[PDB]
Amino acid sequence: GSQMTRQARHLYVGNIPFGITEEAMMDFFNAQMRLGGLTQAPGNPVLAVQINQDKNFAFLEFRSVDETTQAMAFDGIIFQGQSLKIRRPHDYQPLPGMSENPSVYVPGVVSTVVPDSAHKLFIGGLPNYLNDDQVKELLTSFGPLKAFNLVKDSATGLSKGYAFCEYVDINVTDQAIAGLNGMQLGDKKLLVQRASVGAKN
């Protein structure tokens, strides 16, 4: 369809695996939607994927407004080691009577949106070659995460060596600090503290 028609029928997907094909991306999201019970009709909700490989993002094109909205619940899903960053197009406008936010939660998926808050953590000193899944697994031993993002270099996809997170249980925050702060990992030592402590400004 037209560009206007696509505003409510596609999503931005950032942090995509290097070298993934459009077909493999499409098959992944169709499988996740179908196997998660998140379709509104028989068949595949995702019609196409357009990748910008040099800029490390894709747009997923859906056949329906409601399926596009529900797919926002996959923000943070791990695929080939990467946490996919799912967002609305910047020009999205809510449509009359159509939900702006997903209605159903997808078990296991940890959001990449980590707002500044009392118990948001900064994790610094990570070896830059560890991927999102590996860092997530390091943090999850203390308890389940509500949100997590590993900061990547825009040009290499390598990490910048630091991440942010928020635990489901606010009390896990201090347990994760106690366990991980000062821990040797590679040639590095981790720094783990509430992000408000060292935030620039």
Residue numbers in the entry: 141 to 341
Which text from the study accompanies this structure?
U2AF2 is a critical pre-mRNA splicing factor for the early stage of spliceosome assembly at the major class of 3′ splice sites. Two central RNA recognition motifs (RRM1 and RRM2) recognize a polypyrimidine consensus sequence (Py tract) composed primarily of uridines and at lower frequencies, cytidines. Structures of the U2AF2 RNA binding domain show an “open”, side-by-side conformation of the RRMs binds to uridine-rich Py tracts. Considering that the NDD-affected residues are located near the RNA interface of U2AF2 structures, here we investigated the hypothesis that disrupted U2AF2–RNA interactions could contribute to altered pre-mRNA splicing by the recurrent NDD-associated variants. De novo mutations affecting the pre-mRNA splicing factor U2AF2 are associated with developmental delays and intellectual disabilities, yet the molecular basis is unknown. To address this question, we determined the X-ray crystal structures of Arg149Trp- and Arg150His-substituted U2AF212L bound to Py tract oligonucleotides at 1.4 Å resolutions.
The Arg149Trp, Arg150His, and Arg150Cys substitutions decreased the apparent binding affinity of U2AF212L for this consensus site by approximately three-, four-, and five-fold. The sequence of the cocrystallized Py tract (5′-phosphoryl-UU(dU)U(5Br-dU)CC-3′) corresponds to a 3′ splice site of the AdML transcript, a well-characterized substrate for in vitro pre-mRNA splicing (e.g.,9,16). Like Arg149Trp, the Arg150His substitution indirectly disrupted Arg146–RNA interactions. For the Arg150His variant, the N-terminal U2AF212L α-helix shifted closer to the oligonucleotide. Arg146 appeared to be disordered by loss of a Glu201 anchor, as shown by comparing electron density maps in. Instead, Glu201 has shifted to interact with the mutant His150. Water-mediated interactions with the mutant His150 replace direct hydrogen bonds between the WT Arg150 and the N3/O2 atoms of the penultimate nucleobase. Neither of the amino acid substitutions significantly perturbed the other site–i.e., Arg149Trp has little effect on Arg150, and Arg150His had little effect on Arg149. Instead, the NDD-associated substitutions converged on disrupting Arg146 interactions with the terminal nucleotide of the cocrystallized Py tract. Unlike WT, the Arg149Trp, Arg150Cys, or Arg150His U2AF2 variants are unable to detectably promote splicing of a minigene transcript in HEK293T cells.
